[PDB]
């Protein structure tokens, strides 16, 4: 549950033990809590490769079973 750690905020995961990273269209990678700042500040830009996100688009998800 903590990984790498987030890249735009990094610190949930790692430090929250109870979230998720959903990925977007090139297919990356955005915490529970980038999708959160990341949209609320510009929504529309890859949490790393800046993408144009045809319009947000974040798959979250962890549990996988
Ligand atoms: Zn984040
Ligand atoms: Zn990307």
Do not use: I
Not at 21 to 26: A, I, R, S, T
Not at 42 to 58: D, H, I, Q, V, Y
Request: proline share 6%; with cysteine; hydrophobic share 30%.
């Amino acid at each position: 549950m903590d990984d790498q750690g987030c890249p735009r905020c990094k610190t949930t995961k790692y430090r929250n033990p109870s979230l998720k990273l959903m990925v977007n269209v090139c297919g990356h990678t955005l915490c529970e809590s980038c999708v959160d700042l990341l949209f609320v500040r510009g929504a529309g830009n890859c949490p790393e490769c800046g993408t144009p996100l045809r319009k947000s688009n974040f798959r979250v998800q962890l549990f996988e079973d």
